[PDB]
């Protein structure tokens, strides 16, 4: 049965050679799956950084609007003062020409 | 004879592993496609957040101009009040001289 045993050993050798091939290409897929995952983690890390910067940008956006309405009241208070002083300046100028 | 049956079972085992690997390889590729889709979704979320920040920063910068412009506007009115208070005393001097 020398020929029969040889045929078995030749086909066992081929499949045991393929055992290494499957192990090689699964290592390659594991390496590729890790790279895709590590890039995904990097994207999420940047997304959390962008979310925090967006929260800060909206926090300053609100604070500037509080500062804008504060200066708007300052405009309103001074403009009312300007008109009041101009009316008083008019009154003195009327009293001056009277004398 | 018992030797041949051992070779036959061993060959059948390795032929089964080859067929099962074909399913395992397909399973890894389906898992690779899913991970790629999550990455794609993360990239889409990254560009969305960048455009939202770019709009927020441009909206913040214009209000920095508006606030510093109102700063000058307040100063103009503040100096106008002091000018009218100065004119009133000059009028008070002219009134007292009569």
mmCIF file of C-alpha atoms in Angstrom:
data_model
loop_
_atom_site.group_PDB
_atom_site.id
_atom_site.type_symbol
_atom_site.label_atom_id
_atom_site.label_comp_id
_atom_site.label_asym_id
_atom_site.label_seq_id
_atom_site.Cartn_x
_atom_site.Cartn_y
_atom_site.Cartn_z
ATOM 1 C CA UNK A 1 0.000 0.000 0.000
ATOM 2 C CA UNK A 2 3.016 2.301 -0.525
ATOM 3 C CA UNK A 3 1.260 4.317 -3.258
ATOM 4 C CA UNK A 4 -1.985 4.655 -1.277
ATOM 5 C CA UNK A 5 -0.190 5.891 1.867
ATOM 6 C CA UNK A 6 1.846 8.333 -0.266
ATOM 7 C CA UNK A 7 -1.322 9.832 -1.794
ATOM 8 C CA UNK A 8 -2.684 10.415 1.722
ATOM 9 C CA UNK A 9 0.598 11.971 2.928
ATOM 10 C CA UNK A 10 0.749 14.242 -0.142
ATOM 11 C CA UNK A 11 -2.808 15.503 0.445
ATOM 12 C CA UNK A 12 -2.224 15.824 4.202
ATOM 13 C CA UNK A 13 0.913 17.862 3.451
ATOM 14 C CA UNK A 14 -1.072 20.239 1.210
ATOM 15 C CA UNK A 15 -3.808 20.849 3.803
ATOM 16 C CA UNK A 16 -1.243 21.274 6.602
ATOM 17 C CA UNK A 17 0.486 23.810 4.338
ATOM 18 C CA UNK A 18 -2.881 25.551 3.960
ATOM 19 C CA UNK A 19 -3.242 25.526 7.769
ATOM 20 C CA UNK A 20 -0.366 28.035 7.768
ATOM 21 C CA UNK A 21 -1.951 30.011 4.926
ATOM 22 C CA UNK A 22 -5.252 30.445 6.825
ATOM 23 C CA UNK A 23 -3.336 31.445 9.948
ATOM 24 C CA UNK A 24 -1.346 33.975 7.884
ATOM 25 C CA UNK A 25 -4.405 35.600 6.270
ATOM 26 C CA UNK A 26 -6.352 35.695 9.562
ATOM 27 C CA UNK A 27 -3.393 37.489 11.167
ATOM 28 C CA UNK A 28 -3.589 39.985 8.286
ATOM 29 C CA UNK A 29 -7.335 40.483 8.864
ATOM 30 C CA UNK A 30 -6.748 40.961 12.609
ATOM 31 C CA UNK A 31 -4.079 43.571 11.801
ATOM 32 C CA UNK A 32 -6.480 45.339 9.410
ATOM 33 C CA UNK A 33 -9.391 45.201 11.885
ATOM 34 C CA UNK A 34 -7.198 46.768 14.557
ATOM 35 C CA UNK A 35 -6.144 49.643 12.265
ATOM 36 C CA UNK A 36 -9.790 50.400 11.425
ATOM 37 C CA UNK A 37 -10.673 50.270 15.138
ATOM 38 C CA UNK A 38 -7.730 52.479 16.177
ATOM 39 C CA UNK A 39 -8.764 55.065 13.572
ATOM 40 C CA UNK A 40 -12.360 54.864 14.848
ATOM 41 C CA UNK A 41 -11.154 55.518 18.421
ATOM 42 C CA UNK A 42 -9.109 58.484 17.130
ATOM 43 C CA UNK A 43 -12.242 59.855 15.415
ATOM 44 C CA UNK A 44 -14.300 59.496 18.598
ATOM 45 C CA UNK A 45 -11.486 61.181 20.574
ATOM 46 C CA UNK A 46 -11.625 64.103 18.120
ATOM 47 C CA UNK A 47 -15.444 64.130 18.252
ATOM 48 C CA UNK A 48 -15.391 64.472 22.055
ATOM 49 C CA UNK A 49 -12.854 67.293 21.634
ATOM 50 C CA UNK A 50 -15.107 68.977 19.078
ATOM 51 C CA UNK A 51 -18.167 68.616 21.343
ATOM 52 C CA UNK A 52 -16.314 70.289 24.233
ATOM 53 C CA UNK A 53 -15.142 73.125 21.960
ATOM 54 C CA UNK A 54 -18.723 73.541 20.694
ATOM 55 C CA UNK A 55 -19.966 73.820 24.296
ATOM 56 C CA UNK A 56 -17.290 76.442 25.038
ATOM 57 C CA UNK A 57 -18.094 78.393 21.851
ATOM 58 C CA UNK A 58 -21.775 78.522 22.855
ATOM 59 C CA UNK A 59 -20.841 79.515 26.426
ATOM 60 C CA UNK A 60 -18.844 82.510 25.165
ATOM 61 C CA UNK A 61 -21.596 83.223 22.608
ATOM 62 C CA UNK A 62 -24.038 83.630 25.506
ATOM 63 C CA UNK A 63 -21.618 85.723 27.603
ATOM 64 C CA UNK A 64 -20.952 88.115 24.701
ATOM 65 C CA UNK A 65 -24.723 88.551 24.255
ATOM 66 C CA UNK A 66 -25.015 89.416 27.964
ATOM 67 C CA UNK A 67 -22.201 91.944 27.438
ATOM 68 C CA UNK A 68 -23.912 93.319 24.301
ATOM 69 C CA UNK A 69 -27.246 93.971 26.046
ATOM 70 C CA UNK A 70 -25.299 95.527 28.950
ATOM 71 C CA UNK A 71 -23.712 98.055 26.577
ATOM 72 C CA UNK A 72 -27.105 98.587 24.899
ATOM 73 C CA UNK A 73 -28.563 99.744 28.240
ATOM 74 C CA UNK A 74 -25.496 102.002 28.593
ATOM 75 C CA UNK A 75 -26.391 103.505 25.196
ATOM 76 C CA UNK A 76 -30.023 103.965 26.312
ATOM 77 C CA UNK A 77 -29.050 105.573 29.642
ATOM 78 C CA UNK A 78 -26.537 107.993 28.088
ATOM 79 C CA UNK A 79 -28.851 108.939 25.192
ATOM 80 C CA UNK A 80 -31.596 109.804 27.699
ATOM 81 C CA UNK A 81 -28.991 111.865 29.572
ATOM 82 C CA UNK A 82 -27.905 113.630 26.348
ATOM 83 C CA UNK A 83 -31.509 114.611 25.518
ATOM 84 C CA UNK A 84 -32.125 115.773 29.108
ATOM 85 C CA UNK A 85 -28.988 117.954 29.082
ATOM 86 C CA UNK A 86 -29.923 119.431 25.681
ATOM 87 C CA UNK A 87 -33.374 120.365 27.019
ATOM 88 C CA UNK A 88 -31.726 121.972 30.062
ATOM 89 C CA UNK A 89 -29.203 123.763 27.814
ATOM 90 C CA UNK A 90 -32.139 125.095 25.780
ATOM 91 C CA UNK A 91 -33.837 126.375 28.964
ATOM 92 C CA UNK A 92 -30.721 128.291 30.063
ATOM 93 C CA UNK A 93 -30.322 129.780 26.586
ATOM 94 C CA UNK A 94 -33.967 130.931 26.690
ATOM 95 C CA UNK A 95 -33.416 132.544 30.114
ATOM 96 C CA UNK A 96 -30.222 134.220 28.833
ATOM 97 C CA UNK A 97 -31.858 136.051 25.900
ATOM 98 C CA UNK A 98 -34.628 137.078 28.316
ATOM 99 C CA UNK A 99 -32.006 139.075 30.243
ATOM 100 C CA UNK B 1 -5.773 -1.475 6.996
ATOM 101 C CA UNK B 2 -6.300 0.269 10.350
ATOM 102 C CA UNK B 3 -3.487 2.556 9.173
ATOM 103 C CA UNK B 4 -5.527 3.565 6.099
ATOM 104 C CA UNK B 5 -8.596 4.375 8.232
ATOM 105 C CA UNK B 6 -6.427 6.689 10.361
ATOM 106 C CA UNK B 7 -5.213 8.508 7.226
ATOM 107 C CA UNK B 8 -8.811 8.748 5.951
ATOM 108 C CA UNK B 9 -10.164 10.292 9.179
ATOM 109 C CA UNK B 10 -7.206 12.702 9.367
ATOM 110 C CA UNK B 11 -7.781 13.840 5.769
ATOM 111 C CA UNK B 12 -11.509 14.253 6.478
ATOM 112 C CA UNK B 13 -10.672 16.400 9.528
ATOM 113 C CA UNK B 14 -8.426 18.756 7.518
ATOM 114 C CA UNK B 15 -10.962 18.941 4.666
ATOM 115 C CA UNK B 16 -13.597 19.932 7.240
ATOM 116 C CA UNK B 17 -11.307 22.645 8.657
ATOM 117 C CA UNK B 18 -10.871 24.085 5.144
ATOM 118 C CA UNK B 19 -14.658 24.296 4.687
ATOM 119 C CA UNK B 20 -15.190 25.771 8.152
ATOM 120 C CA UNK B 21 -12.434 28.351 7.544
ATOM 121 C CA UNK B 22 -14.312 29.510 4.447
ATOM 122 C CA UNK B 23 -17.258 30.325 6.741
ATOM 123 C CA UNK B 24 -14.919 31.882 9.339
ATOM 124 C CA UNK B 25 -13.280 34.049 6.654
ATOM 125 C CA UNK B 26 -16.711 35.238 5.468
ATOM 126 C CA UNK B 27 -17.606 35.969 9.112
ATOM 127 C CA UNK B 28 -14.455 38.095 9.498
ATOM 128 C CA UNK B 29 -15.188 39.990 6.259
ATOM 129 C CA UNK B 30 -18.769 40.749 7.365
ATOM 130 C CA UNK B 31 -17.310 42.014 10.653
ATOM 131 C CA UNK B 32 -14.741 44.064 8.693
ATOM 132 C CA UNK B 33 -17.527 45.682 6.675
ATOM 133 C CA UNK B 34 -19.413 46.614 9.862
ATOM 134 C CA UNK B 35 -16.327 48.187 11.485
ATOM 135 C CA UNK B 36 -15.730 50.136 8.253
ATOM 136 C CA UNK B 37 -19.322 51.436 8.418
ATOM 137 C CA UNK B 38 -18.833 52.639 12.008
ATOM 138 C CA UNK B 39 -15.619 54.385 10.904
ATOM 139 C CA UNK B 40 -17.527 56.007 8.012
ATOM 140 C CA UNK B 41 -20.248 57.137 10.453
ATOM 141 C CA UNK B 42 -17.546 58.570 12.752
ATOM 142 C CA UNK B 43 -16.013 60.487 9.840
ATOM 143 C CA UNK B 44 -19.467 61.843 8.911
ATOM 144 C CA UNK B 45 -19.963 62.919 12.542
ATOM 145 C CA UNK B 46 -16.478 64.490 12.545
ATOM 146 C CA UNK B 47 -17.168 66.721 9.517
ATOM 147 C CA UNK B 48 -20.596 67.663 10.930
ATOM 148 C CA UNK B 49 -19.056 68.815 14.207
ATOM 149 C CA UNK B 50 -16.357 70.793 12.360
ATOM 150 C CA UNK B 51 -18.965 72.718 10.340
ATOM 151 C CA UNK B 52 -20.973 73.422 13.513
ATOM 152 C CA UNK B 53 -17.829 74.728 15.240
ATOM 153 C CA UNK B 54 -16.826 76.770 12.165
ATOM 154 C CA UNK B 55 -20.265 78.424 12.240
ATOM 155 C CA UNK B 56 -20.061 78.979 16.020
ATOM 156 C CA UNK B 57 -16.594 80.575 15.786
ATOM 157 C CA UNK B 58 -17.683 82.858 12.925
ATOM 158 C CA UNK B 59 -20.777 83.764 14.963
ATOM 159 C CA UNK B 60 -18.533 84.499 17.963
ATOM 160 C CA UNK B 61 -16.036 86.614 15.992
ATOM 161 C CA UNK B 62 -18.685 88.972 14.569
ATOM 162 C CA UNK B 63 -19.981 89.622 18.101
ATOM 163 C CA UNK B 64 -16.427 90.510 19.164
ATOM 164 C CA UNK B 65 -16.549 93.193 16.456
ATOM 165 C CA UNK B 66 -20.057 94.250 17.559
ATOM 166 C CA UNK B 67 -19.029 94.496 21.233
ATOM 167 C CA UNK B 68 -15.907 96.551 20.469
ATOM 168 C CA UNK B 69 -17.987 98.750 18.136
ATOM 169 C CA UNK B 70 -20.547 99.354 20.905
ATOM 170 C CA UNK B 71 -17.559 100.122 23.156
ATOM 171 C CA UNK B 72 -16.735 103.046 20.837
ATOM 172 C CA UNK B 73 -20.440 103.998 20.616
ATOM 173 C CA UNK B 74 -20.703 104.201 24.428
ATOM 174 C CA UNK B 75 -17.525 106.329 24.557
ATOM 175 C CA UNK B 76 -18.993 108.785 22.020
ATOM 176 C CA UNK B 77 -22.103 109.260 24.178
ATOM 177 C CA UNK B 78 -20.024 109.418 27.381
ATOM 178 C CA UNK B 79 -17.910 112.233 25.915
ATOM 179 C CA UNK B 80 -21.092 113.954 24.657
ATOM 180 C CA UNK B 81 -22.592 113.979 28.178
ATOM 181 C CA UNK B 82 -19.397 115.584 29.534
ATOM 182 C CA UNK B 83 -19.494 118.149 26.701
ATOM 183 C CA UNK B 84 -23.077 119.194 27.520
ATOM 184 C CA UNK B 85 -22.269 119.414 31.247
ATOM 185 C CA UNK B 86 -19.354 121.668 30.256
ATOM 186 C CA UNK B 87 -21.625 123.835 28.079
ATOM 187 C CA UNK B 88 -24.182 124.129 30.903
ATOM 188 C CA UNK B 89 -21.590 125.604 33.282
ATOM 189 C CA UNK B 90 -20.412 127.974 30.528
ATOM 190 C CA UNK B 91 -24.077 128.980 30.264
ATOM 191 C CA UNK B 92 -24.234 129.224 34.054
ATOM 192 C CA UNK B 93 -21.274 131.644 33.968
ATOM 193 C CA UNK B 94 -22.948 133.806 31.284
ATOM 194 C CA UNK B 95 -26.213 133.816 33.270
ATOM 195 C CA UNK B 96 -24.408 134.893 36.464
ATOM 196 C CA UNK B 97 -22.645 137.756 34.645
ATOM 197 C CA UNK B 98 -26.067 139.304 33.938
#
